[PDB]
Amino acid sequence: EQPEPRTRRRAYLWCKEFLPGAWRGLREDEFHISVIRGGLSNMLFQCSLPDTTATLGDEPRKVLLRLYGAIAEAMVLESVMFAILAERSLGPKLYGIFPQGRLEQFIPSRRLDTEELSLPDISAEIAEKMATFHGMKMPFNKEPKWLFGTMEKYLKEVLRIKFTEESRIKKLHKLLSYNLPLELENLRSLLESTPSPVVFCHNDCQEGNILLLEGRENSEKQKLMLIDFEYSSYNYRGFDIGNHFCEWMYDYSYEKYPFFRANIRKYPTKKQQLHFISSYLPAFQNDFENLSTEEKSIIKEEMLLEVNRFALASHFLWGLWSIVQAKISSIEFGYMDYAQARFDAYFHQKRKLGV
Amino acid sequence: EQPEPRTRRRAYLWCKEFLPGAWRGLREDEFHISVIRGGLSNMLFQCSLPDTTATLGDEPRKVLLRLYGAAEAMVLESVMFAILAERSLGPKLYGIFPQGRLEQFIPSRRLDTEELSLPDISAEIAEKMATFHGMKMPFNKEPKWLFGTMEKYLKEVLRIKFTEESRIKKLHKLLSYNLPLELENLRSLLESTPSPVVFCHNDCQEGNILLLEGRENSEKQKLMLIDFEYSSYNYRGFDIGNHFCEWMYDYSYEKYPFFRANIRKYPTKKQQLHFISSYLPAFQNDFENLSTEEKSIIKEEMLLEVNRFALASHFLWGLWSIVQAKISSIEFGYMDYAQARFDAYFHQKRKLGV
Numbered sequence: 001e002q003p004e005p006r007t008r009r010r011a012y013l014w015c016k017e018f019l020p021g022a023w024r025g026l027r028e029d030e031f032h033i034s035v036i037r038g039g040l041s042n043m044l045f046q047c048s049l050p051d052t053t054a055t056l057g058d059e060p061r062k063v064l065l066r067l068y069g070a071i072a073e074a075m076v077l078e079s080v081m082f083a084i085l086a087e088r089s090l091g092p093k094l095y096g097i098f099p100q101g102r103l104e105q106f107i108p109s110r111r112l113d114t115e116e117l118s119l120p121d122i123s124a125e126i127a128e129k130m131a132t133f134h135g136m137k138m139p140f141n142k143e144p145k146w147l148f149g150t151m152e153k154y155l156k157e158v159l160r161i162k163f164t165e166e167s168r169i170k171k172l173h174k175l176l177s178y179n180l181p182l183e184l185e186n187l188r189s190l191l192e193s194t195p196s197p198v199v200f201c202h203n204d205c206q207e208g209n210i211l212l213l214e215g216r217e218n219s220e221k222q223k224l225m226l227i228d229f230e231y232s233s234y235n236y237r238g239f240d241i242g243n244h245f246c247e248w249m250y251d252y253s254y255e256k257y258p259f260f261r262a263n264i265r266k267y268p269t270k271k272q273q274l275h276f277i278s279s280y281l282p283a284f285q286n287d288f289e290n291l292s293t294e295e296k297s298i299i300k301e302e303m304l305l306e307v308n309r310f311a312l313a314s315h316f317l318w319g320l321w322s323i324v325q326a327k328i329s330s331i332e333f334g335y336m337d338y339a340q341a342r343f344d345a346y347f348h349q350k351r352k353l354g355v
Numbered sequence: 356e357q358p359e360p361r362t363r364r365r366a367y368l369w370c371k372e373f374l375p376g377a378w379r380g381l382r383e384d385e386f387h388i389s390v391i392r393g394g395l396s397n398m399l400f401q402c403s404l405p406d407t408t409a410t411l412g413d414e415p416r417k418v419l420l421r422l423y424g425a426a427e428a429m430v431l432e433s434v435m436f437a438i439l440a441e442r443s444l445g446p447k448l449y450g451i452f453p454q455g456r457l458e459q460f461i462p463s464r465r466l467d468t469e470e471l472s473l474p475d476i477s478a479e480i481a482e483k484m485a486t487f488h489g490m491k492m493p494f495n496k497e498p499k500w501l502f503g504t505m506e507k508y509l510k511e512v513l514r515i516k517f518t519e520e521s522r523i524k525k526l527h528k529l530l531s532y533n534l535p536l537e538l539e540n541l542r543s544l545l546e547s548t549p550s551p552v553v554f555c556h557n558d559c560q561e562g563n564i565l566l567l568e569g570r571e572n573s574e575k576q577k578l579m580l581i582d583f584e585y586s587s588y589n590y591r592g593f594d595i596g597n598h599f600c601e602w603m604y605d606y607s608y609e610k611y612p613f614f615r616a617n618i619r620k621y622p623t624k625k626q627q628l629h630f631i632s633s634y635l636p637a638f639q640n641d642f643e644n645l646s647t648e649e650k651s652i653i654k655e656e657m658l659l660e661v662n663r664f665a666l667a668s669h670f671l672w673g674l675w676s677i678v679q680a681k682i683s684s685i686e687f688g689y690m691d692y693a694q695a696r697f698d699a700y701f702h703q704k705r706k707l708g709v
């Protein structure tokens with residue numbers, strides 16, 4: 001609820017010095033702060049004026065304080081990107097930036113639950129928002145090295161790690177038995193033969209990174225915001241959509257070990273996939289709706305092949321990622337069980353595609 | 356004019372990887388690059404497509420490559436540059452990477468010192484500066500930059516020992532003024548001088564003002580302010596005072612000490628009134644509706660303000676130049692420039708009777 005007394009005091013000075021109006025002349029004893037998220041990295045706090053204090057101009061009543069904590073040229077990219085999205089009215093406003101963190105617009109909202117991804121109005125808007133993200137010019141590397149670069153890097157770490165615990169040695173032995181280095185090379189040749197435009201991708205578009213905006217619940221459209229662009233890069237479009245479709249199957253809010261639920265049957269049906277891309281394509285491609293019914297159908301069918309092939313890379317990348325987390329992460333989670341779930345889905349999807 | 360071998364190749368990869376369209380499929384042997392500014396810090400290059408190559412979309416034909424060369428200074432400048440680019444108040448930002456960035460190439464030349472006094476130039480610098488001062492930026496709104504920077508440079512100056520006889524004698528004369536005490540006299544003068552806190556350029560001089568190619572015949576819209584390295588929330592008086600000081604300094608002199616200083620080039624009361632008469636209505640659009648008497652009172656107070664803050668321009672950049680004398684590898688009469696700034700400081704102090 002309340003933060004440590006040292007971070008209360010640091011938060012007070014940051015707010016007092018970076019925010020205009022009533023903030024400039026606020027006393028420590030009138031400063032309201034409360035935790036939104038703990039951890040050792042990207043701690044969130046809500047900072048606010050007293051309800052009895054009047055604003056003098058257009059300064060916010062409440063802001064979000066983000067402390068980096070345990071983390072250079074990762075911070076400039078994220079900071080520039082955040083600033084750019086704020087200027088374009090695609091993200092929260094940026095009120096303050098300093099070495100320890102930043103002050104952001106506080107958006108009254110909650111995150112989505114996994115089940116909400118299949119609500120047709122939610123799915124259609126995630127598609128429209130993702131299409132808008134993909135149309136953005138960003139001053140980052142346009143070479144799509146991120147996907148295979150990251151898979152190669154995680155695979156290298158996976159082959160070199162040894163466990164001592166009996167359960168983890170048995171689980172790792174099963175995963176290595178798939179011949180991951182060979183499977184990676186089969187995946188490379190499949191995806192190289194699968195045309196997918198290079199676009200600015202979120203790379204982690206899941207329920208936990210989608211805000212439902214308070215007061216907008218009754219609106220069909222324009223009630224969501226995409227956040228948390230930690231993994232964002234120029235990447236194959238197919239991966240961003242494929243990864244999103246995969247995330248229909250995974251719930252990270254389960255309160256008992258292994259702290260996730262996986263359900264292969266929750267993957268979107270062809271009808272749910274077509275609903276999603278029917279909203280994506282007109283948002284991404286000017287006057288898509290004016291094309292012939294036959295051309296629209298052909299583009300849609302090709303895109304389903306594309307995103308369902310790139311979905312394999314979602315399973316592979318996050319599967320490898322989870323094995324590495326099993327060794328190095330201090331967050332309590334069934335990393336090895338999650339890896340097995342991703343590889344089970346990888347082979348299930350391989351069978352469905354006939355590849 | 357031609358870059359080194361490794362720089363040609365690194366520039367080619369940066370342009371190929373960060374720029375869209377025809378840049379994506381460009382070969383080494385088609386890449387055109389030429390130096391605009393040398394050194395081992397803030398090297399500038401012009402990079403361009405062949406004249407024979409067609410653009411595929413709205414990608415630029417030519418871009419500026421800026422290499423930093425020589426942490427939390429680079430994030431602020433980068434965020435600020437990105438923000439000004441989104442607001443169409445700076446060059447577009449095409450690429451950012453650890454070694455530098457790719458910027459919009461603006462067809463232009465820099466102003467000469469003599470051009471600052473042309474009434475149409477002066478009026479537009481005032482309008483542009485007033486626009487800059489209106490901007491909301493995600494930086495510290497406490498005006499700690501001015502005295503914080505003077506304190507920091509003074510700390511470095513009192514640690515300098517030279518071995519060369521001429522530099523020891525020049526430093527000894529500057530230290531003889533009791534700089535720590537003079538800084539405190541300046542503090543008491545400026546703390547008694549009201550000046551609103553605004554987002555300041557802090558270095559508004561002819562070399563940071565572009566005359567835009569094709570717009571020479573335009574009365575009001577032919578300039579752009581660039582190079583926001585020193586930008587921060589600061590007293591408005593300093594941004595204008597520093598600009599008035601820069602009428603006296605020409606950094607294009609071809610012989611040692613590679614600058615000219617002329618105290619007589621400082622703007623007259625008439626030139627100062629012309630500048631602030633353009634600034635005030637650009638900063639507050641309702642200014643012209645005030646009574647002639649109220650406008651006159653605000654203008655007279657502002658002349659006191661900016662001419663007092665001008666003393667901080669001499670002090671700050673004087674201290675800065677002494678430190679450059681020790682640490683800089685750029686050829687310049689840093690110690691002579693420091694003495695020129697302190698000569699001006701004491702000359703203007705006496706004229707003001709403060």
Ligand SMILES: COc1cc2c(N(C)C3CCN(C(C)C)CC3)nc(C3CCCCC3)nc2cc1OCCCN1CCCC1
Pocket residue numbers: 037038039040204206252253254255259318331332333
């Ligand atoms: C994907 O696995 C994650 C699980 C996390 C977690 N999980 C799932 C646990 C699960 C159990 N939760 C309670 C019930 C014990 C604590 C959070 N808690 C947190 C919190 C965020 C604030 C609190 C400190 C860290 N952060 C997590 C981050 C995670 O990955 C982030 C990058 C990977 N993404 C790509 C693939 C999907 C996710």
Ligand SMILES: COc1cc2c(N(C)C3CCN(C(C)C)CC3)nc(C3CCCCC3)nc2cc1OCCCN1CCCC1
Pocket residue numbers: 558560562606607609613672675685686687
């Ligand atoms: C010491 O600061 C400067 C040095 C310059 C220079 N210096 C450092 C040298 C002078 C001697 N050099 C050679 C001939 C030996 C050339 C560049 N050459 C130039 C020229 C202007 C004409 C066109 C080319 C760039 N312009 C310069 C401009 C400078 O601006 C100072 C204003 C910035 N403020 C911040 C700190 C002081 C006040």
Ligand SMILES: [Cl-]
Pocket residue numbers: 077078081229230232233
């Ligand atoms: Cl990024």
Ligand SMILES: [Cl-]
Pocket residue numbers: 186187190350355
């Ligand atoms: Cl395969």
Ligand SMILES: [Cl-]
Pocket residue numbers: 431432435494584585586587
């Ligand atoms: Cl800055």
Ligand SMILES: [Cl-]
Pocket residue numbers: 516517518519522
């Ligand atoms: Cl020396």
Ligand SMILES: [Cl-]
Pocket residue numbers: none
């Ligand atoms: Cl005297």
Ligand SMILES: [Mg+2]
Pocket residue numbers: 114206207246247248249250251252
């Ligand atoms: Mg999910």
Ligand SMILES: [Mg+2]
Pocket residue numbers: 468560561600601602603604605606
């Ligand atoms: Mg000058």
